[PDB]
Ligand binder design. Structure first.
Ligand SMILES: NC(=O)c1ccc[n+]([C@@H]2O[C@H](COP(=O)([O-])OP(=O)(O)OC[C@H]3O[C@@H](n4cnc5c(N)ncnc54)[C@H](OP(=O)(O)O)[C@@H]3O)[C@@H](O)[C@H]2O)c1
Ligand SMILES: NC(=O)c1ccc[n+]([C@@H]2O[C@H](COP(=O)([O-])OP(=O)(O)OC[C@H]3O[C@@H](n4cnc5c(N)ncnc54)[C@H](OP(=O)(O)O)[C@@H]3O)[C@@H](O)[C@H]2O)c1
Ligand SMILES: CN[C@H]1CCc2c(cccc2OC)C1
Ligand SMILES: CN[C@H]1CCc2c(cccc2OC)C1
Lengths: 291, 291
């Protein structure tokens, strides 16, 4: 497939995707707010369009890799007259509802729309470890699937344009929160003179074990939460809530951020007040669903 | 060995540790606030002492597996007169400073003290995957190391009794925060009718990749944070902050807990206000150290 592709947005992801697409034999026309930044991919075979209009008109497939969806409007507003008959694939972070409204804005300018959420950093783009979530019209996904597969294995979730965005925001909810916690833990160990080079491999060593730990003793949290099975036999909210109290205390004494640990503390405290101290930690999901 | 051990606290950890110790040939004398709960381990060879005093006097080594350190005072107050010449190994969660003061309380009652933090769930106790952090007097750790190894690989951190407690709280800072985030993400996907049985394997699938993702493009976060190297080449705080904004927005719309994502959002917001939008995400640690 040598389908001509347009890609707008040349951050690390944009550049990595351009390169994978070029290497697969697709002519790629790029445009960036900062044209200088295109020099790299242009040396690798990308064609730099002078204008958004020219970039849009070069391909039936327009990929956006921008910081947010406001950026899509900013870049495409001058080109709205040239959208008809093309597919917009937006690979950018934003709210699910912004995304759904953006899909309708594409349709009304005569374009089809697909949502994508890329699940790996730029060096892993186009490798066997790469994967991307997609939602939107099935026929649109199918028409371009072979081209999109170059960036990463697609995981089509269905027709709601909001859905692959919600999945992305859910995944990044885990990922960013985990990262903030790693920095929080590092900070805490830092106050007793432990360096980050010592602390971070300890913390990562533990995180690597987390899938196994969650499965020990034949727990299966998903089905359990669906079934409303929260049995406390191997760990209770009381016992885990206490630890959450201990982390807040240690953090207070360490002079570091209290908001992250107090949020966690509040999940346990809520479940206890609601009378489920004796349940497994999965029960905190009830309080989370109903503030 | 065949060294006699006392273990107090027969939650799942206490019971799993008793069993591993029995299986290794150690005579184990147990005591629990609720004696009924000892039936299982007694069937497996444990001896149930009638009284705390009697349990303490049965061995040179007293292991405590209790919800917190207040529980240690509660259980051992009547036995303070029988502590002299024995080692207390506390394998309970609490603050580092509570732990340090508890060590001094043991010394005052004529006992030695070791801090432990068990890093695996009860089904993994006494297996190759098990490990435990220890801090306190080197001579005391050495005297009992061969007994303690039955529970899990020891990771001795040094002489400060607070240190293995701080390490435990740091590790549980990551672990609990991660778990809360998984429940948060599950809740969020739940509001579009995605079940936890569908969502949790997606989220865990991602979390499994997190060590690799952090190392992509030759980042090595620990040394970088120690060196103050926060280069924004492959990901910026601006870009990650925006996603954190998007998670908050999606969560507001989803009607779910805002405290957890807003804590994460604030880490990015702070770094940006302080003028490091362009840096890698590791830079959030500065704001976390200095609220
Ligand atoms: N980096 C990662 O590892 C990673 C992984 C998966 C997903 N993502 C997502 O992928 C997208 C791209 O991320 P990235 O890290 O490659 O880059 P980024 O730093 O988000 O920037 C990407 C592009 O956005 C452009 N831009 C931003 N605001 C704009 C506006 N108002 N008008 C015009 N252009 C605008 C930048 O223009 P200039 O070049 O002119 O500044 C740049 O070309 C983001 O939505 C991100 O959340 C990133
Ligand atoms: N569960 C895990 O996966 C895990 C893994 C690592 C670390 N830990 C840590 O290991 C420790 C034990 O946790 P666990 O889950 O096995 O059990 P737990 O639910 O924390 O309770 C353990 C024991 O604490 C006793 N206890 C609590 N308050 C007491 C008090 N005031 N006076 C007397 N006894 C008291 C209970 O007595 P009763 O039996 O009479 O109620 C029970 O025997 C905790 O500090 C926990 O953070 C747990
Ligand atoms: C169902 N999750 C378990 C996994 C192990 C664990 C739990 C609670 C506290 C500490 C733990 O391991 C360090 C519950
Ligand atoms: C090492 N920092 C990168 C890792 C991957 C990543 C970042 C930000 C957003 C999404 C990402 O991958 C899913 C920062």
């Amino acid at each position: 497939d040598r389908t001509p592709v347009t890609l707008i947005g040349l951050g690390p992801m944009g550049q990595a995707m351009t390169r994978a697409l070029l290497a697969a034999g697709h002519p790629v026309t790029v445009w960036n707010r900062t044209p200088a930044r295109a020099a790299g991919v242009v040396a690798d075979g990308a064609v730099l369009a002078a204008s958004p209009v020219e970039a849009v008109e070069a391909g039936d497939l327009v990929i956006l890799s921008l910081t947010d969806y406001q950026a899509m409007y900013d870049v495409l507003e001058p080109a709205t007259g040239s959208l008809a008959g093309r597919t917009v694939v937006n690979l950018s972070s934003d709210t699910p509802d912004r995304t759904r409204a953006a899909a309708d804005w594409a349709t009304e300018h005569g374009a089809t729309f697909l949502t994508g959420g890329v699940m790996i950093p730029a060096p892993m783009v186009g490798t066997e470890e790469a994967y991307v979530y997609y939602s939107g019209p099935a026929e649109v996904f199918e028409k371009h699937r072979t081209t999109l597969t170059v960036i990463g294995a697609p995981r089509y979730l269905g027709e709601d344009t909001g859905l692959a965005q919600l999945m992305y925001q859910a995944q990044l909810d885990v990922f960013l929160t985990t990262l903030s916690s790693l920095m929080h833990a590092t900070a805490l160990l830092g106050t007793a003179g432990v360096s980050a080079a010592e602390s971070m491999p300890e913390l990562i060593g533990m995180l690597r074990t987390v899938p196994a730990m969650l499965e020990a003793g034949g727990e299966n949290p998903g089905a359990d939460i669906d079934a409303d099975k929260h049995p406390g036999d191997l760990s209770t909210i009381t016992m885990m809530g206490a630890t959450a109290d201990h982390i807040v205390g240690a953090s207070e004494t360490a002079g570091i951020d209290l908001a992250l640990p107090r949020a966690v503390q509040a999940h346990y405290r809520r479940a206890i007040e609601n009378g489920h101290g004796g349940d497994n930690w999965t029960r905190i999901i009830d309080g989370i669903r109903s503030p």
